[PDB]
PDB file of C-alpha atoms in Angstrom:
ATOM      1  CA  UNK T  30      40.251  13.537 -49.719  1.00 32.44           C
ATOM      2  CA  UNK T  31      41.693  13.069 -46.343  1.00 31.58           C
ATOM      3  CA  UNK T  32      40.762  16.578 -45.576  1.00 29.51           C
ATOM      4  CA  UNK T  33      37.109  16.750 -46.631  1.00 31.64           C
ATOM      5  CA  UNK T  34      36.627  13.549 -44.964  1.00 27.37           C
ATOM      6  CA  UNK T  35      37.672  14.718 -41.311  1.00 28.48           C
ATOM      7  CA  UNK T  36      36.302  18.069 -41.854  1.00 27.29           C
ATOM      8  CA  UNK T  37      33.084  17.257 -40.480  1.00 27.47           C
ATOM      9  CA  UNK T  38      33.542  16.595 -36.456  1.00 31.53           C
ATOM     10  CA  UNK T  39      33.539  20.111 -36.040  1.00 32.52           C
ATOM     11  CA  UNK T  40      30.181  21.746 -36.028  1.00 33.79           C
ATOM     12  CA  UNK T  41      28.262  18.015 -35.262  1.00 36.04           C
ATOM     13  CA  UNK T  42      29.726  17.604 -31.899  1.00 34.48           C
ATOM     14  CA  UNK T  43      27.503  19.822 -29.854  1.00 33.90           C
ATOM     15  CA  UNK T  44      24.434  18.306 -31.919  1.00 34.47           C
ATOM     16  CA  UNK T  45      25.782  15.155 -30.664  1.00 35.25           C
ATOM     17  CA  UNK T  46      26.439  15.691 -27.317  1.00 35.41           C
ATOM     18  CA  UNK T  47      22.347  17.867 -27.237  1.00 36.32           C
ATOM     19  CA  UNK T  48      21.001  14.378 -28.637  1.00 35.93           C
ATOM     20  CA  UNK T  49      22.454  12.093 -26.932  1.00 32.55           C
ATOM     21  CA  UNK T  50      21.321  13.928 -23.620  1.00 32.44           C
ATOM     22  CA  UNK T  51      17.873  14.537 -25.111  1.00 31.49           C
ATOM     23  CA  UNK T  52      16.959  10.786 -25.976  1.00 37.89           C
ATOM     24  CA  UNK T  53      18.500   9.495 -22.915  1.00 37.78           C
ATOM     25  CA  UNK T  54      16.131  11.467 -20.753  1.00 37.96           C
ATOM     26  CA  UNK T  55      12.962  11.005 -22.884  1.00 36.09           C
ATOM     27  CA  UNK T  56      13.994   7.596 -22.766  1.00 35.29           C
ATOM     28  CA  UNK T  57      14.122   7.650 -18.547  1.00 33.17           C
ATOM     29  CA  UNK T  58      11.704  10.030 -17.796  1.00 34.77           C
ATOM     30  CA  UNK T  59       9.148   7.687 -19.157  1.00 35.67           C
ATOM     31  CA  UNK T  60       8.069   6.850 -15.658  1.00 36.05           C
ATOM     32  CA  UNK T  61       5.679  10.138 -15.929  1.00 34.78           C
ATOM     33  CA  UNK T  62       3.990   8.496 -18.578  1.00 34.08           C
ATOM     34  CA  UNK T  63       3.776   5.425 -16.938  1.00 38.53           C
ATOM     35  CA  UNK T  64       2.015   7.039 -14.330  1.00 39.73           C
ATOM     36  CA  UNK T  65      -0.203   9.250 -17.011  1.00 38.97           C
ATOM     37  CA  UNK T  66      -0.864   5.172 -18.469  1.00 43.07           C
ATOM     38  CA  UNK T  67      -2.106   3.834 -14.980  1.00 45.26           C
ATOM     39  CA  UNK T  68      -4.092   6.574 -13.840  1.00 44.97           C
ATOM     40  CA  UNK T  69      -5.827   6.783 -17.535  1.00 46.15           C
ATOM     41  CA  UNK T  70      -6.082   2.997 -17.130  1.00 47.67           C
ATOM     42  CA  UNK T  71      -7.396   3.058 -13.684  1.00 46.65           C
ATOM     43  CA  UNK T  72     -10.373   6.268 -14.846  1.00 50.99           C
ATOM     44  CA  UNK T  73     -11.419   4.636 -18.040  1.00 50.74           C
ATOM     45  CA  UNK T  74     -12.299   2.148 -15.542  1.00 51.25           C
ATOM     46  CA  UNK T  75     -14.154   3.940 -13.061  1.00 49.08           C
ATOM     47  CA  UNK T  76     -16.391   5.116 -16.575  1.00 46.63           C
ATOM     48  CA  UNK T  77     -16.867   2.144 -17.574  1.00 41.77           C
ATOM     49  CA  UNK T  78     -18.366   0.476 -14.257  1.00 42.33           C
ATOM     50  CA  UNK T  79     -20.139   4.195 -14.723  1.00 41.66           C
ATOM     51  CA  UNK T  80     -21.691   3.185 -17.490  1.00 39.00           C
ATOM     52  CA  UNK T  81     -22.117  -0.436 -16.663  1.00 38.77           C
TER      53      UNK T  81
ATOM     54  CA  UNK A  24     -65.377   6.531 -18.393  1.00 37.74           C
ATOM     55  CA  UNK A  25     -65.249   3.161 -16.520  1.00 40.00           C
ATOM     56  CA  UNK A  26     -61.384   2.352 -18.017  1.00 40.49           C
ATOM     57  CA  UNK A  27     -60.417   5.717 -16.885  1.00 40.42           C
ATOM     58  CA  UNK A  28     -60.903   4.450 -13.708  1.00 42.72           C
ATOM     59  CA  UNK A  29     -60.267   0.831 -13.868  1.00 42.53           C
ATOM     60  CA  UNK A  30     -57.069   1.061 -15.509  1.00 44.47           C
ATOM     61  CA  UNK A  31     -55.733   3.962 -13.020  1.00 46.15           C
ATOM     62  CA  UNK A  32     -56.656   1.912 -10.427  1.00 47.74           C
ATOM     63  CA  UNK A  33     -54.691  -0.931 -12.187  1.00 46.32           C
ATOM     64  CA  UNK A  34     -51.596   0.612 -12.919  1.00 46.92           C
ATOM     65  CA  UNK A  35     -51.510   2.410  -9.388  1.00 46.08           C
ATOM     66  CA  UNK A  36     -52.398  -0.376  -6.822  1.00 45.42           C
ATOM     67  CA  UNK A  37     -49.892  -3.276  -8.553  1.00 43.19           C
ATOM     68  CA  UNK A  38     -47.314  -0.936  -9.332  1.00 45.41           C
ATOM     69  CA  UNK A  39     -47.399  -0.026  -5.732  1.00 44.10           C
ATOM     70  CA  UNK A  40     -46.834  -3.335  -4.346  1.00 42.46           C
ATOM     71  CA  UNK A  41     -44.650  -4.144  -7.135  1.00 42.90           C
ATOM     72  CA  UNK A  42     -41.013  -1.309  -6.950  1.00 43.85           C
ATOM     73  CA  UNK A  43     -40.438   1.565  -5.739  1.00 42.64           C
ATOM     74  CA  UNK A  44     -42.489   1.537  -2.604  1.00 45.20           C
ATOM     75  CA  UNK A  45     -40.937  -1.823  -2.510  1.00 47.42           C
ATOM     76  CA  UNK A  46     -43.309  -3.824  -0.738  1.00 49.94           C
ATOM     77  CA  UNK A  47     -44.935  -7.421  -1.366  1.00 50.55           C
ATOM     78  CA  UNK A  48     -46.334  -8.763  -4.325  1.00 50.73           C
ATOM     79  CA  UNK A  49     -50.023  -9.244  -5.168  1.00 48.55           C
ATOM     80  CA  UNK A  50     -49.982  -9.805  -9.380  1.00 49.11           C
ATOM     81  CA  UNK A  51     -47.868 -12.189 -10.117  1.00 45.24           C
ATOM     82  CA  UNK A  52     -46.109 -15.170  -8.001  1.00 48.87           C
ATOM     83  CA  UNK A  53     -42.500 -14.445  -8.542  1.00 50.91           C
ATOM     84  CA  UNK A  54     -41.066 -11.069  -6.435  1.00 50.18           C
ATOM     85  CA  UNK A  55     -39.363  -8.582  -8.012  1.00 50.86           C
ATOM     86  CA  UNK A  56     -38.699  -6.833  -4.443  1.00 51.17           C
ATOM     87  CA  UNK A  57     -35.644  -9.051  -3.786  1.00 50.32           C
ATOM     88  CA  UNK A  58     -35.157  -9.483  -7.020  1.00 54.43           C
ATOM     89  CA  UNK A  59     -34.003  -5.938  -9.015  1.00 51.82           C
ATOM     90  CA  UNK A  60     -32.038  -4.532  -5.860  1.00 54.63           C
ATOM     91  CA  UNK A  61     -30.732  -7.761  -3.690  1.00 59.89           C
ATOM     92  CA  UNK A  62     -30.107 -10.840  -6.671  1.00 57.41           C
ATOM     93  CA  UNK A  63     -29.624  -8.139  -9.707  1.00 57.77           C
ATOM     94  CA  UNK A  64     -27.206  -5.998  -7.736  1.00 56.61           C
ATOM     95  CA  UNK A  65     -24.509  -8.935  -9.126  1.00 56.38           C
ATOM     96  CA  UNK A  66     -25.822  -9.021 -12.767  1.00 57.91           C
ATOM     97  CA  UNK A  67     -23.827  -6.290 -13.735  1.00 56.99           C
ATOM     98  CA  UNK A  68     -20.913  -7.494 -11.643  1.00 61.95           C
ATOM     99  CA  UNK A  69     -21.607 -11.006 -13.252  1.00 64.99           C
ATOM    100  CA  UNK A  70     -21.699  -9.344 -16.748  1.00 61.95           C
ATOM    101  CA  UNK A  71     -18.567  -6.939 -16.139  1.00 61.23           C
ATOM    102  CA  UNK A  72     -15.346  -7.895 -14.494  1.00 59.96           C
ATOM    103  CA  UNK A  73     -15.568  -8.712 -10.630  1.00 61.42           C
ATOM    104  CA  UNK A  74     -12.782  -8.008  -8.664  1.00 59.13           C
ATOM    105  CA  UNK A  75     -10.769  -6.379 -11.192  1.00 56.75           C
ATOM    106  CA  UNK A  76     -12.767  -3.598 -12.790  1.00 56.76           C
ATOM    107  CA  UNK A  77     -15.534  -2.893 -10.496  1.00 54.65           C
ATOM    108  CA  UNK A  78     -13.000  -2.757  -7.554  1.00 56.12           C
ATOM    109  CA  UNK A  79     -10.211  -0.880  -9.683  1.00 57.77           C
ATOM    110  CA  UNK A  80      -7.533  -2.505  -8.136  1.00 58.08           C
ATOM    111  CA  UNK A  81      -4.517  -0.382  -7.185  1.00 57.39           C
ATOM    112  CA  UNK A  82      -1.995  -2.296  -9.367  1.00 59.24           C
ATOM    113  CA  UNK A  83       1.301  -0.725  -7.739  1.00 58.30           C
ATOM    114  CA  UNK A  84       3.162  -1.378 -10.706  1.00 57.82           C
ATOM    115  CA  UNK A  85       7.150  -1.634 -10.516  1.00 58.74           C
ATOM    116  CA  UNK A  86       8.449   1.885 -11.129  1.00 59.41           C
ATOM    117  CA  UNK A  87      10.680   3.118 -14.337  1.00 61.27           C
ATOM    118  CA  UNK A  88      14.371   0.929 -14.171  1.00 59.84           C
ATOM    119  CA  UNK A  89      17.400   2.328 -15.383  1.00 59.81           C
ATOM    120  CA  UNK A  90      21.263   1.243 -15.650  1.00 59.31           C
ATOM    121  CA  UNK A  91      21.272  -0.132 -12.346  1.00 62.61           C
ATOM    122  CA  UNK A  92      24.371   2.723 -11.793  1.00 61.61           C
ATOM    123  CA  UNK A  93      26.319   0.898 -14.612  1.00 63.40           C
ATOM    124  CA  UNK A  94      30.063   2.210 -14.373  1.00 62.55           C
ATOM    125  CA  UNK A  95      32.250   3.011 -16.810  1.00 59.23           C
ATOM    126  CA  UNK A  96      32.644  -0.286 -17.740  1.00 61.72           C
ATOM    127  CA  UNK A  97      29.346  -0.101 -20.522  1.00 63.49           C
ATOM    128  CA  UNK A  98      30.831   3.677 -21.376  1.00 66.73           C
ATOM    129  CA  UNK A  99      34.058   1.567 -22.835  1.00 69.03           C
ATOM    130  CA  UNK A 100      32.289  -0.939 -24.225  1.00 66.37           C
ATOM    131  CA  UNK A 101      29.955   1.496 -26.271  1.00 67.66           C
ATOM    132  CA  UNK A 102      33.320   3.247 -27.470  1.00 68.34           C
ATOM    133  CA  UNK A 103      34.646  -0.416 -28.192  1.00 72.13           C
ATOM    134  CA  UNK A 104      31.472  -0.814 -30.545  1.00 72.71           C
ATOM    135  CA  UNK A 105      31.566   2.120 -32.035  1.00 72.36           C
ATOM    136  CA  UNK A 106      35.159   1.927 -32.644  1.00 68.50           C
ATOM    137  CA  UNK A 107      35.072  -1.492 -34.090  1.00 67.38           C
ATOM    138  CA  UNK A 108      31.769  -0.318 -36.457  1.00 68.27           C
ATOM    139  CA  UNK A 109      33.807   2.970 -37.492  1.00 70.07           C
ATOM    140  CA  UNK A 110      36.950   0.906 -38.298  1.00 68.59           C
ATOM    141  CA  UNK A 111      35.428  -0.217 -41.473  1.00 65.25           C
ATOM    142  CA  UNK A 112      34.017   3.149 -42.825  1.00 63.73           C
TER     143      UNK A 112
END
């Protein structure tokens, strides 16, 4: 029991480490999308007055 | 016929001095000169958002934080928690 219970930090290490380091920078790199955000923001605007 | 005059006449002399020559108004009392271009040029900006909108402001908004260049010191408290939520397993 001991055995099968450690036997798993073998192969799920390197999936760890990937995901770890993939959410962290999709979680920081969201300043490009807040940029995306404000410029949509800022041309939905310029329609709208358009159409106004 | 006489209408095919009169009405031509009509729709071509008030009309004149009425928009888009833009000059006087025989008809009718109240101008509609001033009125479309000069007092109407704010109806829109009355009915929309002045300001705000029309102008677009350019809203610098404060860019992306992060860790604030945390040290090790939340790296040892995230193995703390994890070793004090893997104790029980």
């Amino acid at each position: 029991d001991r055995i099968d219970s450690v036997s798993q930090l073998q192969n799920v290490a390197e999936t760890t480490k990937v995901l770890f380091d993939v959410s962290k920078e999709t979680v920081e790199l969201e300043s490009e999308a807040f940029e995306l955000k404000q410029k949509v923001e800022l041309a939905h605007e310029a329609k709208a007055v358009l159409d106004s | 016929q006489d209408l095919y005059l009169r009405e031509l006449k009509d729709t071509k002399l008030a009309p004149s001095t009425l928009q888009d020559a833009e000059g006087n108004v025989k008809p009718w009392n109240p101008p509609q000169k001033p009125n479309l271009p000069e007092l109407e040029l704010q109806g829109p900006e009355a009915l929309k958002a002045y300001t705000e909108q029309n102008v677009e402001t350019a809203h610098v908004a404060k860019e992306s934080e992060e860790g604030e260049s945390e040290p090790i010191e939340e790296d040892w408290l995230v193995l703390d928690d994890a070793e004090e939520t893997k104790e029980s397993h």
